[PDB]
PDB file of all heavy atoms in Angstrom:
ATOM      1  N   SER A  69      -6.955  32.479 -18.616  1.00  0.00           N
ATOM      2  CA  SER A  69      -7.659  31.200 -18.646  1.00  0.00           C
ATOM      3  C   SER A  69      -6.780  30.023 -19.082  1.00  0.00           C
ATOM      4  O   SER A  69      -7.187  28.884 -18.901  1.00  0.00           O
ATOM      5  CB  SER A  69      -8.831  31.282 -19.575  1.00  0.00           C
ATOM      6  OG  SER A  69      -8.355  31.721 -20.836  1.00  0.00           O
ATOM      7  N   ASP A  70      -5.658  30.279 -19.755  1.00  0.00           N
ATOM      8  CA  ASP A  70      -4.707  29.239 -20.128  1.00  0.00           C
ATOM      9  C   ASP A  70      -3.722  28.901 -19.009  1.00  0.00           C
ATOM     10  O   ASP A  70      -3.104  27.852 -19.096  1.00  0.00           O
ATOM     11  CB  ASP A  70      -3.860  29.644 -21.335  1.00  0.00           C
ATOM     12  CG  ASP A  70      -4.627  29.847 -22.626  1.00  0.00           C
ATOM     13  OD1 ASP A  70      -5.702  29.233 -22.751  1.00  0.00           O
ATOM     14  OD2 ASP A  70      -4.163  30.660 -23.468  1.00  0.00           O
ATOM     15  N   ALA A  71      -3.547  29.773 -18.007  1.00  0.00           N
ATOM     16  CA  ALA A  71      -2.519  29.581 -16.987  1.00  0.00           C
ATOM     17  C   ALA A  71      -2.856  28.336 -16.176  1.00  0.00           C
ATOM     18  O   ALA A  71      -4.023  28.073 -15.916  1.00  0.00           O
ATOM     19  CB  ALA A  71      -2.422  30.800 -16.102  1.00  0.00           C
ATOM     20  N   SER A  72      -1.849  27.541 -15.818  1.00  0.00           N
ATOM     21  CA  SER A  72      -2.065  26.454 -14.869  1.00  0.00           C
ATOM     22  C   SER A  72      -2.123  27.019 -13.445  1.00  0.00           C
ATOM     23  O   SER A  72      -1.479  28.013 -13.104  1.00  0.00           O
ATOM     24  CB  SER A  72      -1.016  25.402 -14.985  1.00  0.00           C
ATOM     25  OG  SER A  72       0.250  26.017 -14.915  1.00  0.00           O
ATOM     26  N   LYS A  73      -2.929  26.359 -12.634  1.00  0.00           N
ATOM     27  CA  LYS A  73      -2.899  26.489 -11.195  1.00  0.00           C
ATOM     28  C   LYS A  73      -1.599  25.889 -10.679  1.00  0.00           C
ATOM     29  O   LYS A  73      -1.009  25.027 -11.338  1.00  0.00           O
ATOM     30  CB  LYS A  73      -4.065  25.707 -10.583  1.00  0.00           C
ATOM     31  CG  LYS A  73      -5.474  26.159 -10.946  1.00  0.00           C
ATOM     32  CD  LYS A  73      -6.543  25.424 -10.156  1.00  0.00           C
ATOM     33  CE  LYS A  73      -6.574  23.922 -10.395  1.00  0.00           C
ATOM     34  NZ  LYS A  73      -7.306  23.203  -9.323  1.00  0.00           N
ATOM     35  N   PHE A  74      -1.172  26.364  -9.502  1.00  0.00           N
ATOM     36  CA  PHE A  74       0.008  25.865  -8.822  1.00  0.00           C
ATOM     37  C   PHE A  74      -0.344  25.636  -7.367  1.00  0.00           C
ATOM     38  O   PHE A  74      -1.366  26.136  -6.902  1.00  0.00           O
ATOM     39  CB  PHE A  74       1.202  26.820  -8.936  1.00  0.00           C
ATOM     40  CG  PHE A  74       1.023  28.130  -8.235  1.00  0.00           C
ATOM     41  CD1 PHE A  74       1.677  28.381  -7.033  1.00  0.00           C
ATOM     42  CD2 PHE A  74       0.197  29.113  -8.772  1.00  0.00           C
ATOM     43  CE1 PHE A  74       1.490  29.590  -6.369  1.00  0.00           C
ATOM     44  CE2 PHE A  74      -0.013  30.306  -8.095  1.00  0.00           C
ATOM     45  CZ  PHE A  74       0.659  30.557  -6.914  1.00  0.00           C
ATOM     46  N   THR A  75       0.530  24.913  -6.655  1.00  0.00           N
ATOM     47  CA  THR A  75       0.360  24.704  -5.226  1.00  0.00           C
ATOM     48  C   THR A  75       1.727  24.531  -4.568  1.00  0.00           C
ATOM     49  O   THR A  75       2.681  24.040  -5.197  1.00  0.00           O
ATOM     50  CB  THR A  75      -0.574  23.511  -4.984  1.00  0.00           C
ATOM     51  OG1 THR A  75      -0.739  23.322  -3.578  1.00  0.00           O
ATOM     52  CG2 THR A  75      -0.099  22.204  -5.592  1.00  0.00           C
ATOM     53  N   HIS A  76       1.804  24.904  -3.289  1.00  0.00           N
ATOM     54  CA  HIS A  76       2.966  24.601  -2.471  1.00  0.00           C
ATOM     55  C   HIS A  76       2.838  23.218  -1.830  1.00  0.00           C
ATOM     56  O   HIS A  76       3.826  22.705  -1.324  1.00  0.00           O
ATOM     57  CB  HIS A  76       3.222  25.723  -1.467  1.00  0.00           C
ATOM     58  CG  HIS A  76       2.179  25.795  -0.434  1.00  0.00           C
ATOM     59  ND1 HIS A  76       1.010  26.498  -0.628  1.00  0.00           N
ATOM     60  CD2 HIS A  76       2.092  25.217   0.768  1.00  0.00           C
ATOM     61  CE1 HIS A  76       0.252  26.348   0.432  1.00  0.00           C
ATOM     62  NE2 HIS A  76       0.877  25.560   1.280  1.00  0.00           N
ATOM     63  N   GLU A  77       1.668  22.578  -1.923  1.00  0.00           N
ATOM     64  CA  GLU A  77       1.420  21.267  -1.338  1.00  0.00           C
ATOM     65  C   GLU A  77       2.072  20.168  -2.195  1.00  0.00           C
ATOM     66  O   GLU A  77       1.648  19.887  -3.321  1.00  0.00           O
ATOM     67  CB  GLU A  77      -0.091  21.047  -1.197  1.00  0.00           C
ATOM     68  CG  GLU A  77      -0.817  22.031  -0.286  1.00  0.00           C
ATOM     69  CD  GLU A  77      -0.813  21.804   1.218  1.00  0.00           C
ATOM     70  OE1 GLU A  77      -0.326  20.751   1.688  1.00  0.00           O
ATOM     71  OE2 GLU A  77      -1.304  22.707   1.928  1.00  0.00           O
ATOM     72  N   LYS A  78       3.130  19.568  -1.648  1.00  0.00           N
ATOM     73  CA  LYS A  78       3.947  18.563  -2.315  1.00  0.00           C
ATOM     74  C   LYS A  78       4.155  17.379  -1.364  1.00  0.00           C
ATOM     75  O   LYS A  78       5.264  17.148  -0.881  1.00  0.00           O
ATOM     76  CB  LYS A  78       5.334  19.121  -2.616  1.00  0.00           C
ATOM     77  CG  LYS A  78       5.467  20.237  -3.606  1.00  0.00           C
ATOM     78  CD  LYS A  78       6.943  20.568  -3.802  1.00  0.00           C
ATOM     79  CE  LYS A  78       7.504  21.452  -2.716  1.00  0.00           C
ATOM     80  NZ  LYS A  78       6.773  22.738  -2.619  1.00  0.00           N
ATOM     81  N   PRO A  79       3.110  16.580  -1.044  1.00  0.00           N
ATOM     82  CA  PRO A  79       3.325  15.330  -0.306  1.00  0.00           C
ATOM     83  C   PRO A  79       4.233  14.362  -1.075  1.00  0.00           C
ATOM     84  O   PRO A  79       4.306  14.406  -2.303  1.00  0.00           O
ATOM     85  CB  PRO A  79       1.903  14.796  -0.104  1.00  0.00           C
ATOM     86  CG  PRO A  79       1.107  15.447  -1.218  1.00  0.00           C
ATOM     87  CD  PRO A  79       1.698  16.830  -1.348  1.00  0.00           C
ATOM     88  N   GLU A  80       4.984  13.534  -0.336  1.00  0.00           N
ATOM     89  CA  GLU A  80       5.881  12.550  -0.930  1.00  0.00           C
ATOM     90  C   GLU A  80       5.121  11.548  -1.788  1.00  0.00           C
ATOM     91  O   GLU A  80       4.007  11.159  -1.451  1.00  0.00           O
ATOM     92  CB  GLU A  80       6.638  11.787   0.153  1.00  0.00           C
ATOM     93  CG  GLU A  80       7.664  12.659   0.847  1.00  0.00           C
ATOM     94  CD  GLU A  80       8.758  11.919   1.611  1.00  0.00           C
ATOM     95  OE1 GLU A  80       8.537  10.713   1.958  1.00  0.00           O
ATOM     96  OE2 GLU A  80       9.808  12.555   1.891  1.00  0.00           O
ATOM     97  N   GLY A  81       5.744  11.155  -2.908  1.00  0.00           N
ATOM     98  CA  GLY A  81       5.146  10.222  -3.852  1.00  0.00           C
ATOM     99  C   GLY A  81       5.506  10.577  -5.293  1.00  0.00           C
ATOM    100  O   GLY A  81       6.562  11.138  -5.523  1.00  0.00           O
ATOM    101  N   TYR A  82       4.607  10.276  -6.228  1.00  0.00           N
ATOM    102  CA  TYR A  82       4.877  10.430  -7.645  1.00  0.00           C
ATOM    103  C   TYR A  82       4.047  11.589  -8.201  1.00  0.00           C
ATOM    104  O   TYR A  82       2.936  11.827  -7.745  1.00  0.00           O
ATOM    105  CB  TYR A  82       4.633   9.099  -8.347  1.00  0.00           C
ATOM    106  CG  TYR A  82       5.711   8.083  -8.077  1.00  0.00           C
ATOM    107  CD1 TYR A  82       5.477   6.996  -7.245  1.00  0.00           C
ATOM    108  CD2 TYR A  82       6.988   8.237  -8.607  1.00  0.00           C
ATOM    109  CE1 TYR A  82       6.477   6.080  -6.959  1.00  0.00           C
ATOM    110  CE2 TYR A  82       7.992   7.320  -8.359  1.00  0.00           C
ATOM    111  CZ  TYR A  82       7.736   6.244  -7.511  1.00  0.00           C
ATOM    112  OH  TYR A  82       8.685   5.277  -7.266  1.00  0.00           O
ATOM    113  N   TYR A  83       4.677  12.318  -9.132  1.00  0.00           N
ATOM    114  CA  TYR A  83       4.148  13.471  -9.839  1.00  0.00           C
ATOM    115  C   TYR A  83       4.283  13.189 -11.337  1.00  0.00           C
ATOM    116  O   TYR A  83       4.910  12.205 -11.733  1.00  0.00           O
ATOM    117  CB  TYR A  83       4.877  14.728  -9.339  1.00  0.00           C
ATOM    118  CG  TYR A  83       4.506  15.086  -7.926  1.00  0.00           C
ATOM    119  CD1 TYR A  83       5.104  14.458  -6.827  1.00  0.00           C
ATOM    120  CD2 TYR A  83       3.421  15.911  -7.673  1.00  0.00           C
ATOM    121  CE1 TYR A  83       4.698  14.718  -5.522  1.00  0.00           C
ATOM    122  CE2 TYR A  83       3.013  16.194  -6.375  1.00  0.00           C
ATOM    123  CZ  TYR A  83       3.621  15.560  -5.297  1.00  0.00           C
ATOM    124  OH  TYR A  83       3.182  15.828  -4.018  1.00  0.00           O
ATOM    125  N   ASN A  84       3.737  14.087 -12.159  1.00  0.00           N
ATOM    126  CA  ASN A  84       3.635  13.929 -13.601  1.00  0.00           C
ATOM    127  C   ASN A  84       4.505  14.944 -14.305  1.00  0.00           C
ATOM    128  O   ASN A  84       4.504  16.094 -13.935  1.00  0.00           O
ATOM    129  CB  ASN A  84       2.208  14.168 -14.067  1.00  0.00           C
ATOM    130  CG  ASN A  84       1.242  13.265 -13.334  1.00  0.00           C
ATOM    131  OD1 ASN A  84       1.076  12.111 -13.719  1.00  0.00           O
ATOM    132  ND2 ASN A  84       0.633  13.769 -12.272  1.00  0.00           N
ATOM    133  N   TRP A  85       5.238  14.514 -15.335  1.00  0.00           N
ATOM    134  CA  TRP A  85       5.746  15.423 -16.337  1.00  0.00           C
ATOM    135  C   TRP A  85       5.735  14.759 -17.708  1.00  0.00           C
ATOM    136  O   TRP A  85       5.222  13.654 -17.852  1.00  0.00           O
ATOM    137  CB  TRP A  85       7.095  16.008 -15.921  1.00  0.00           C
ATOM    138  CG  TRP A  85       8.299  15.166 -16.196  1.00  0.00           C
ATOM    139  CD1 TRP A  85       8.418  13.816 -16.085  1.00  0.00           C
ATOM    140  CD2 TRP A  85       9.600  15.644 -16.568  1.00  0.00           C
ATOM    141  NE1 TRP A  85       9.692  13.422 -16.357  1.00  0.00           N
ATOM    142  CE2 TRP A  85      10.441  14.519 -16.659  1.00  0.00           C
ATOM    143  CE3 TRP A  85      10.138  16.906 -16.824  1.00  0.00           C
ATOM    144  CZ2 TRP A  85      11.787  14.624 -16.997  1.00  0.00           C
ATOM    145  CZ3 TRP A  85      11.473  17.012 -17.151  1.00  0.00           C
ATOM    146  CH2 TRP A  85      12.288  15.885 -17.232  1.00  0.00           C
ATOM    147  N   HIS A  86       6.214  15.513 -18.711  1.00  0.00           N
ATOM    148  CA  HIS A  86       6.186  15.125 -20.117  1.00  0.00           C
ATOM    149  C   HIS A  86       6.763  13.722 -20.329  1.00  0.00           C
ATOM    150  O   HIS A  86       6.202  12.944 -21.065  1.00  0.00           O
ATOM    151  CB  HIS A  86       6.923  16.172 -20.961  1.00  0.00           C
ATOM    152  CG  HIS A  86       6.803  15.907 -22.419  1.00  0.00           C
ATOM    153  ND1 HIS A  86       5.590  15.964 -23.070  1.00  0.00           N
ATOM    154  CD2 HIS A  86       7.713  15.604 -23.360  1.00  0.00           C
ATOM    155  CE1 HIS A  86       5.770  15.706 -24.362  1.00  0.00           C
ATOM    156  NE2 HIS A  86       7.043  15.472 -24.562  1.00  0.00           N
ATOM    157  N   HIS A  87       7.861  13.390 -19.656  1.00  0.00           N
ATOM    158  CA  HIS A  87       8.552  12.111 -19.830  1.00  0.00           C
ATOM    159  C   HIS A  87       8.047  11.003 -18.898  1.00  0.00           C
ATOM    160  O   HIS A  87       8.694   9.963 -18.819  1.00  0.00           O
ATOM    161  CB  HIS A  87      10.060  12.339 -19.671  1.00  0.00           C
ATOM    162  CG  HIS A  87      10.599  13.387 -20.611  1.00  0.00           C
ATOM    163  ND1 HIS A  87      10.477  13.283 -21.980  1.00  0.00           N
ATOM    164  CD2 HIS A  87      11.271  14.523 -20.399  1.00  0.00           C
ATOM    165  CE1 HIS A  87      11.037  14.335 -22.538  1.00  0.00           C
ATOM    166  NE2 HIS A  87      11.513  15.108 -21.592  1.00  0.00           N
ATOM    167  N   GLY A  88       6.952  11.212 -18.139  1.00  0.00           N
ATOM    168  CA  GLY A  88       6.359  10.210 -17.269  1.00  0.00           C
ATOM    169  C   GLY A  88       6.419  10.596 -15.784  1.00  0.00           C
ATOM    170  O   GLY A  88       6.059  11.699 -15.424  1.00  0.00           O
ATOM    171  N   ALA A  89       6.816   9.660 -14.922  1.00  0.00           N
ATOM    172  CA  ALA A  89       6.706   9.796 -13.481  1.00  0.00           C
ATOM    173  C   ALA A  89       7.935  10.482 -12.882  1.00  0.00           C
ATOM    174  O   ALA A  89       9.064  10.189 -13.277  1.00  0.00           O
ATOM    175  CB  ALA A  89       6.528   8.420 -12.885  1.00  0.00           C
ATOM    176  N   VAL A  90       7.699  11.390 -11.919  1.00  0.00           N
ATOM    177  CA  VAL A  90       8.719  12.088 -11.150  1.00  0.00           C
ATOM    178  C   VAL A  90       8.464  11.761  -9.681  1.00  0.00           C
ATOM    179  O   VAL A  90       7.388  12.016  -9.152  1.00  0.00           O
ATOM    180  CB  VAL A  90       8.677  13.618 -11.345  1.00  0.00           C
ATOM    181  CG1 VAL A  90       9.860  14.320 -10.691  1.00  0.00           C
ATOM    182  CG2 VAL A  90       8.568  13.982 -12.811  1.00  0.00           C
ATOM    183  N   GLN A  91       9.472  11.223  -9.016  1.00  0.00           N
ATOM    184  CA  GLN A  91       9.364  10.885  -7.620  1.00  0.00           C
ATOM    185  C   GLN A  91       9.720  12.125  -6.822  1.00  0.00           C
ATOM    186  O   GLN A  91      10.703  12.768  -7.174  1.00  0.00           O
ATOM    187  CB  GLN A  91      10.340   9.756  -7.294  1.00  0.00           C
ATOM    188  CG  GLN A  91      10.176   9.275  -5.876  1.00  0.00           C
ATOM    189  CD  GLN A  91      11.165   8.212  -5.481  1.00  0.00           C
ATOM    190  OE1 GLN A  91      12.184   7.964  -6.124  1.00  0.00           O
ATOM    191  NE2 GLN A  91      10.870   7.602  -4.352  1.00  0.00           N
ATOM    192  N   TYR A  92       8.954  12.405  -5.757  1.00  0.00           N
ATOM    193  CA  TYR A  92       9.288  13.426  -4.789  1.00  0.00           C
ATOM    194  C   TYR A  92       9.486  12.746  -3.439  1.00  0.00           C
ATOM    195  O   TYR A  92       8.590  12.077  -2.921  1.00  0.00           O
ATOM    196  CB  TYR A  92       8.191  14.486  -4.654  1.00  0.00           C
ATOM    197  CG  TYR A  92       8.583  15.676  -3.818  1.00  0.00           C
ATOM    198  CD1 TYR A  92       9.679  16.451  -4.187  1.00  0.00           C
ATOM    199  CD2 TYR A  92       7.893  16.026  -2.660  1.00  0.00           C
ATOM    200  CE1 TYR A  92      10.085  17.527  -3.424  1.00  0.00           C
ATOM    201  CE2 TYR A  92       8.272  17.132  -1.908  1.00  0.00           C
ATOM    202  CZ  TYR A  92       9.394  17.855  -2.274  1.00  0.00           C
ATOM    203  OH  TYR A  92       9.817  18.948  -1.573  1.00  0.00           O
ATOM    204  N   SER A  93      10.658  12.962  -2.863  1.00  0.00           N
ATOM    205  CA  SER A  93      11.090  12.210  -1.697  1.00  0.00           C
ATOM    206  C   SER A  93      12.291  12.927  -1.109  1.00  0.00           C
ATOM    207  O   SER A  93      13.149  13.375  -1.874  1.00  0.00           O
ATOM    208  CB  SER A  93      11.429  10.795  -2.047  1.00  0.00           C
ATOM    209  OG  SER A  93      11.988  10.166  -0.919  1.00  0.00           O
ATOM    210  N   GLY A  94      12.299  13.074   0.230  1.00  0.00           N
ATOM    211  CA  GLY A  94      13.357  13.789   0.927  1.00  0.00           C
ATOM    212  C   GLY A  94      13.634  15.187   0.371  1.00  0.00           C
ATOM    213  O   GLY A  94      14.785  15.609   0.322  1.00  0.00           O
ATOM    214  N   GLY A  95      12.580  15.883  -0.073  1.00  0.00           N
ATOM    215  CA  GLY A  95      12.689  17.237  -0.579  1.00  0.00           C
ATOM    216  C   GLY A  95      13.318  17.356  -1.967  1.00  0.00           C
ATOM    217  O   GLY A  95      13.734  18.462  -2.334  1.00  0.00           O
ATOM    218  N   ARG A  96      13.402  16.245  -2.719  1.00  0.00           N
ATOM    219  CA  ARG A  96      14.065  16.219  -4.017  1.00  0.00           C
ATOM    220  C   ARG A  96      13.152  15.512  -5.016  1.00  0.00           C
ATOM    221  O   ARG A  96      12.593  14.466  -4.702  1.00  0.00           O
ATOM    222  CB  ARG A  96      15.402  15.484  -3.885  1.00  0.00           C
ATOM    223  CG  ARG A  96      16.496  16.320  -3.238  1.00  0.00           C
ATOM    224  CD  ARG A  96      17.252  17.124  -4.287  1.00  0.00           C
ATOM    225  NE  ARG A  96      18.716  17.042  -4.267  1.00  0.00           N
ATOM    226  CZ  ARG A  96      19.430  15.918  -4.368  1.00  0.00           C
ATOM    227  NH1 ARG A  96      18.866  14.739  -4.164  1.00  0.00           N
ATOM    228  NH2 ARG A  96      20.716  15.973  -4.672  1.00  0.00           N
ATOM    229  N   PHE A  97      13.037  16.082  -6.221  1.00  0.00           N
ATOM    230  CA  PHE A  97      12.414  15.424  -7.363  1.00  0.00           C
ATOM    231  C   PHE A  97      13.466  14.608  -8.112  1.00  0.00           C
ATOM    232  O   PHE A  97      14.538  15.113  -8.402  1.00  0.00           O
ATOM    233  CB  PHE A  97      11.797  16.446  -8.310  1.00  0.00           C
ATOM    234  CG  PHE A  97      10.604  17.190  -7.766  1.00  0.00           C
ATOM    235  CD1 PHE A  97      10.757  18.431  -7.164  1.00  0.00           C
ATOM    236  CD2 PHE A  97       9.332  16.623  -7.805  1.00  0.00           C
ATOM    237  CE1 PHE A  97       9.653  19.119  -6.654  1.00  0.00           C
ATOM    238  CE2 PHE A  97       8.225  17.311  -7.315  1.00  0.00           C
ATOM    239  CZ  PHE A  97       8.394  18.547  -6.726  1.00  0.00           C
ATOM    240  N   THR A  98      13.157  13.348  -8.438  1.00  0.00           N
ATOM    241  CA  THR A  98      14.063  12.536  -9.219  1.00  0.00           C
ATOM    242  C   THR A  98      13.319  11.816 -10.341  1.00  0.00           C
ATOM    243  O   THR A  98      12.130  11.586 -10.249  1.00  0.00           O
ATOM    244  CB  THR A  98      14.826  11.506  -8.379  1.00  0.00           C
ATOM    245  OG1 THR A  98      13.874  10.547  -7.945  1.00  0.00           O
ATOM    246  CG2 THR A  98      15.570  12.067  -7.202  1.00  0.00           C
ATOM    247  N   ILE A  99      14.066  11.435 -11.376  1.00  0.00           N
ATOM    248  CA  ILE A  99      13.559  10.652 -12.494  1.00  0.00           C
ATOM    249  C   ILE A  99      14.532   9.510 -12.761  1.00  0.00           C
ATOM    250  O   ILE A  99      15.697   9.616 -12.354  1.00  0.00           O
ATOM    251  CB  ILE A  99      13.371  11.531 -13.757  1.00  0.00           C
ATOM    252  CG1 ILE A  99      14.651  12.288 -14.122  1.00  0.00           C
ATOM    253  CG2 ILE A  99      12.202  12.475 -13.576  1.00  0.00           C
ATOM    254  CD1 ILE A  99      14.678  12.921 -15.497  1.00  0.00           C
ATOM    255  N   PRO A 100      14.119   8.469 -13.524  1.00  0.00           N
ATOM    256  CA  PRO A 100      15.075   7.504 -14.064  1.00  0.00           C
ATOM    257  C   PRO A 100      16.108   8.241 -14.915  1.00  0.00           C
ATOM    258  O   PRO A 100      15.739   9.064 -15.753  1.00  0.00           O
ATOM    259  CB  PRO A 100      14.241   6.544 -14.904  1.00  0.00           C
ATOM    260  CG  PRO A 100      12.817   6.768 -14.453  1.00  0.00           C
ATOM    261  CD  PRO A 100      12.749   8.204 -13.991  1.00  0.00           C
ATOM    262  N   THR A 101      17.400   7.935 -14.710  1.00  0.00           N
ATOM    263  CA  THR A 101      18.458   8.453 -15.564  1.00  0.00           C
ATOM    264  C   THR A 101      18.114   8.105 -17.015  1.00  0.00           C
ATOM    265  O   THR A 101      17.631   7.003 -17.287  1.00  0.00           O
ATOM    266  CB  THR A 101      19.837   7.893 -15.171  1.00  0.00           C
ATOM    267  OG1 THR A 101      20.785   8.702 -15.866  1.00  0.00           O
ATOM    268  CG2 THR A 101      20.073   6.447 -15.555  1.00  0.00           C
ATOM    269  N   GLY A 102      18.269   9.046 -17.935  1.00  0.00           N
ATOM    270  CA  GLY A 102      17.905   8.712 -19.308  1.00  0.00           C
ATOM    271  C   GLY A 102      16.442   8.986 -19.646  1.00  0.00           C
ATOM    272  O   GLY A 102      16.125   8.965 -20.812  1.00  0.00           O
ATOM    273  N   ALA A 103      15.558   9.308 -18.685  1.00  0.00           N
ATOM    274  CA  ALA A 103      14.242   9.853 -19.004  1.00  0.00           C
ATOM    275  C   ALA A 103      14.322  11.253 -19.624  1.00  0.00           C
ATOM    276  O   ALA A 103      13.404  11.642 -20.341  1.00  0.00           O
ATOM    277  CB  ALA A 103      13.374   9.864 -17.767  1.00  0.00           C
ATOM    278  N   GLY A 104      15.367  12.017 -19.281  1.00  0.00           N
ATOM    279  CA  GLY A 104      15.507  13.393 -19.737  1.00  0.00           C
ATOM    280  C   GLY A 104      15.807  13.459 -21.231  1.00  0.00           C
ATOM    281  O   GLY A 104      16.306  12.490 -21.771  1.00  0.00           O
ATOM    282  N   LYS A 105      15.443  14.564 -21.890  1.00  0.00           N
ATOM    283  CA  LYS A 105      15.676  14.783 -23.298  1.00  0.00           C
ATOM    284  C   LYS A 105      16.223  16.193 -23.481  1.00  0.00           C
ATOM    285  O   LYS A 105      16.119  17.020 -22.572  1.00  0.00           O
ATOM    286  CB  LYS A 105      14.387  14.558 -24.085  1.00  0.00           C
ATOM    287  CG  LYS A 105      13.832  13.145 -24.039  1.00  0.00           C
ATOM    288  CD  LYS A 105      14.657  12.120 -24.793  1.00  0.00           C
ATOM    289  CE  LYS A 105      14.186  10.692 -24.604  1.00  0.00           C
ATOM    290  NZ  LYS A 105      14.679  10.132 -23.317  1.00  0.00           N
ATOM    291  N   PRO A 106      16.837  16.520 -24.645  1.00  0.00           N
ATOM    292  CA  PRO A 106      17.219  17.907 -24.935  1.00  0.00           C
ATOM    293  C   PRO A 106      15.992  18.826 -24.899  1.00  0.00           C
ATOM    294  O   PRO A 106      14.900  18.401 -25.277  1.00  0.00           O
ATOM    295  CB  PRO A 106      17.868  17.837 -26.330  1.00  0.00           C
ATOM    296  CG  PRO A 106      18.270  16.377 -26.493  1.00  0.00           C
ATOM    297  CD  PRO A 106      17.212  15.605 -25.737  1.00  0.00           C
ATOM    298  N   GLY A 107      16.182  20.023 -24.330  1.00  0.00           N
ATOM    299  CA  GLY A 107      15.165  21.055 -24.225  1.00  0.00           C
ATOM    300  C   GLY A 107      14.224  20.943 -23.022  1.00  0.00           C
ATOM    301  O   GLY A 107      13.162  21.540 -23.103  1.00  0.00           O
ATOM    302  N   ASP A 108      14.580  20.217 -21.942  1.00  0.00           N
ATOM    303  CA  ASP A 108      13.670  19.995 -20.820  1.00  0.00           C
ATOM    304  C   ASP A 108      13.592  21.170 -19.851  1.00  0.00           C
ATOM    305  O   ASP A 108      12.654  21.215 -19.062  1.00  0.00           O
ATOM    306  CB  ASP A 108      14.044  18.760 -19.996  1.00  0.00           C
ATOM    307  CG  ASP A 108      13.594  17.429 -20.568  1.00  0.00           C
ATOM    308  OD1 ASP A 108      12.668  17.431 -21.435  1.00  0.00           O
ATOM    309  OD2 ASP A 108      14.211  16.383 -20.145  1.00  0.00           O
ATOM    310  N   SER A 109      14.568  22.085 -19.872  1.00  0.00           N
ATOM    311  CA  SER A 109      14.517  23.299 -19.076  1.00  0.00           C
ATOM    312  C   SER A 109      13.194  24.033 -19.289  1.00  0.00           C
ATOM    313  O   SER A 109      12.837  24.350 -20.420  1.00  0.00           O
ATOM    314  CB  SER A 109      15.640  24.234 -19.400  1.00  0.00           C
ATOM    315  OG  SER A 109      16.884  23.646 -19.092  1.00  0.00           O
ATOM    316  N   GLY A 110      12.491  24.284 -18.174  1.00  0.00           N
ATOM    317  CA  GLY A 110      11.258  25.038 -18.140  1.00  0.00           C
ATOM    318  C   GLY A 110      10.018  24.148 -18.144  1.00  0.00           C
ATOM    319  O   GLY A 110       8.913  24.664 -18.027  1.00  0.00           O
TER     320      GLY A 110
END
């Protein structure tokens, strides 16, 4: 009951993570340089 749902459906646009907005475009996720922090793996 704690597990998140997942999907393969990834239309182009903006997604959510801990540090704010993630752009998905041309098959690549990107963030503003410097949005990342230590320990972001996973």
Side-chain angles (χ1 to χ4, degrees):
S69 55
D70 296 334
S72 52
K73 297 187 298 162
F74 66 105
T75 180
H76 69 274
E77 298 278 353
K78 294 183 279 301
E80 290 199 339
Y82 286 107
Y83 290 82
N84 305 277
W85 83 322
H86 186 65
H87 304 302
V90 188
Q91 185 183 15
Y92 189 59
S93 173
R96 283 271 230 57
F97 292 95
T98 69
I99 54 167
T101 193
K105 296 290 173 279
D108 280 341
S109 297

